[PDB]
Amino acid sequence: AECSVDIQGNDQMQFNTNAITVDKSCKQFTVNLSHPGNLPKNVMGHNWVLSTAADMQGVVTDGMASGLDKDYLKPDDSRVIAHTKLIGSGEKDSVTFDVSKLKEGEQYMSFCTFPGHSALMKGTLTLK
Ligand SMILES: [Cu+2]
């Protein structure tokens, strides 16, 4: 809807959508993430992480190194613009960020950094 999107991550490692549009009239933007299915976080947890299309693989690779307790994200990782926490089934998390942080003329991506997930759990973000 305007200024908020509700996205699901399930047990076949699918995100409900894989392209999000972010209206520029919005001052902040909120992502609400939930997890259907019944599998726990240590084997099937999902987060929602944002970076440039170009920064993604680095973020995914160093996130894997940080481990589960760090929610597979390197602390104070300067390339992430916003991210949720890693959640298991029945869990929910939300993240709001300033839309001013998204520059026009750049390509951004949303992905699940949990190891092995990112290949399927990835999508584009358009600022319009
Ligand atoms: Cu995932």
From Swiss-Prot:
Principal cellular location given in the protein's record: periplasm
Gene3D superfamilies: Cupredoxins - blue copper proteins (2.60.40.420)
Metal-binding listed as a keyword: yes
A GO term, aspect molecular function: transition metal ion binding
Organism superkingdom: Bacteria
Entry's localization field: Periplasm
Cystine pairings recorded for this chain: C3-C26
Listed SUPFAM superfamilies: Cupredoxins
Assigned keywords, A-Z: Copper, Disulfide bond, Electron transport, Metal-binding, Periplasm, Signal, Transport
Residues that, per the record, bind Cu cation: H46, C112, H117, M121
InterPro entries in alphabetical order: Azurin, BlueCu_1, BlueCu_1_BS, Cu-binding_ET, Cupredoxin
PROSITE patterns: COPPER_BLUE (PS00196)
Domain annotation Plastocyanin-like: ranges: 1-128
Single GO cellular component term: plasma membrane
Its job: Transfers electrons from cytochrome c551 to cytochrome oxidase.
The name this protein goes by in its record: Azurin
Lineage, uppermost ranks: Bacteria, Pseudomonadati, Pseudomonadota, Gammaproteobacteria, Pseudomonadales
